[PDB]
Amino acid sequence: RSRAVSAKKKAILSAALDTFSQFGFHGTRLEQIAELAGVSKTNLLYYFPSKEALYIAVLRQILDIWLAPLKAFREDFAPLAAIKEYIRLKLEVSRDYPQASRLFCMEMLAGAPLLMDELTGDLKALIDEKSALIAGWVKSGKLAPIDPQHLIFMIWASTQHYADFAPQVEAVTGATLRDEVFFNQTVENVQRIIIEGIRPR
Amino acid sequence: RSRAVSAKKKAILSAALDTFSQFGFHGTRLEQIAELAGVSKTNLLYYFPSKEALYIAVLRQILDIWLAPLKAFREDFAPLAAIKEYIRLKLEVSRDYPQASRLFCMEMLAGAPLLMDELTGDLKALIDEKSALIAGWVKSGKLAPIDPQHLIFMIWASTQHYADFAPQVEAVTGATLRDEVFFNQTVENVQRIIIEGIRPR
Ligand SMILES: O=c1cc[nH]c(=O)[nH]1
Ligand SMILES: O=c1cc[nH]c(=O)[nH]1
């Protein structure tokens, strides 16, 4: 129920996200997340009883933000239209919450030492469910023949690139996703290549 | 053509790759690399005169392997044909050099503090050139109305994804790129999407 209690959790998690994304799992101290969140170690431990708990809690939060649109897919959506929106939402999150993207990525680079079993469990189940859905777009003629998972990965890869690889994107273009023009150019290009790449012909 | 020299340089670069990717730039000490490599610190310093130099060297290796195919591009090439093969080769290097790929990615996550000059200098310079080429194919009607820079980033993103997000790919797929049937499934699919997506119509 409680909004106060949620406000406090979100503050700890937000503070945690920022520290972890700078110092890493092993480099980060609970003492510092507490300082930045404006709460005591005791209070932090009361909500997240181990650094491992907290860290997993922030990573899960990113997944929920990311997977929302995909969880929202239903058997009778217009597929191409749904995918365009998913791409858009994913690029919005790369612009808005790039440190989220970065931490998730950091954890991957280390081998998902903490998040692995979460990927093999909840994530896989969710992807299996929506792969079937997509295969059914394919089976019914609404999409070109494409393997669902590689398509799902492609959306993830191509949208997260702009946060994760921002320094390189900036290096070559002079721009970041916070330039409204460049955001739009990016959305148009990622959408076109992907969507035209899966449009039925 | 000097036997023990060649061998030490390789021992140092490999030791450097492994150590940096565990502990990061600042977590690493030259002593560790030297130790791991079976050379003294002084010896190492003759091959590479600072920690910064060594680190740019390992990342410069994977940069040259990645870019090889792109430097190859010329005005008269069949554009689809060439993009097809580029995708194939990029995924090959994801299969074979995933640790190198991961380190490049980490440097990106860090803001590219140490690599920026390379990105803003030589790499930009190259991508500007090969952008012009690709820009050419589009102008002449040989490709769809695309922005070269973003097509290149999607190739990078989708192909490097299978190395950098390998645990997640395996998590949902049960496969890695070492599994031949998965490797081919990945290439066909990444190719199918990007290629169909940039085909002129
Ligand atoms: O959107 C998502 C969801 C899970 N993993 C990702 O890399 N991206
Ligand atoms: O393949 C490449 C080449 C340059 N930079 C990347 O990130 N990937």
Side-chain angles (χ1 to χ4, degrees), chain A residues 14 18 27 36 49 67 74-75 87 95 104 114 116 143 152 178 181 187 189 191:
Chain A
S14 175
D18 288 1
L36 178 73
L67 295 168
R74 287 298 103 90
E75 173 177 287
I87 291 163
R95 177 188 61 204
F104 190 84
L114 289 177
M116 181 61 108
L143 289 179
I152 285 171
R178 267 163 309 97
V181 169
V187 182
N189 275 269
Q191 275 178 354

Side-chain angles (χ1 to χ4, degrees), chain B residues 40-83 85-138 140-141 143-157:
Chain B
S40 74
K41 196 205 200 110
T42 289
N43 202 168
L44 182 153
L45 282 180
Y46 273 49
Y47 290 85
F48 309 93
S50 76
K51 191 167 76 167
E52 162 161 3
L54 178 44
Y55 182 75
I56 290 172
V58 339
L59 289 170
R60 189 73 229 176
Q61 282 181 131
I62 188 74
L63 217 22
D64 285 356
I65 296 158
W66 280 346
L67 285 178
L70 189 52
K71 291 179 251 184
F73 275 36
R74 300 272 114 77
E75 164 216 63
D76 43 2
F77 276 31
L80 295 184
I83 295 161
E85 200 189 351
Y86 181 25
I87 289 178
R88 199 201 98 235
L89 287 170
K90 279 283 286 151
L91 281 166
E92 283 179 9
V93 337
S94 273
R95 179 189 58 210
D96 295 333
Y97 301 90
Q99 189 174 11
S101 181
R102 287 186 191 115
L103 195 72
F104 186 95
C105 196
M106 299 170 178
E107 174 63 15
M108 294 308 101
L109 302 183
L114 294 156
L115 241 204
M116 193 58 85
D117 283 23
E118 299 288 328
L119 303 178
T120 53
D122 291 9
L123 173 73
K124 181 178 186 304
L126 181 59
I127 296 299
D128 274 358
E129 196 212 313
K130 304 315 184 166
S131 272
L133 261 65
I134 287 148
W137 328 141
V138 315
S140 68
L143 283 177
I146 230 57
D147 297 296
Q149 290 165 324
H150 297 278
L151 174 57
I152 296 165
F153 299 156
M154 193 164 318
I155 297 165
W156 295 355

Side-chain angles (χ1 to χ4, degrees), chain B residues 157-175:
Chain B
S158 51
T159 62
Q160 296 152 218
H161 183 86
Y162 293 86
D164 304 356
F165 283 64
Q168 184 170 59
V169 161
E170 190 181 12
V172 312
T173 270

Side-chain angles (χ1 to χ4, degrees), chain A residues 108 145 147 150 162 189 192 201, chain B residues 147 150 162 167 189 197:
Chain A
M108 294 307 318
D147 176 287
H150 291 297
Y162 287 90
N189 275 269
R192 193 227 188 278
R201 320 204 171 278
Chain B
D147 297 296
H150 297 278
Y162 293 86
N189 277 282

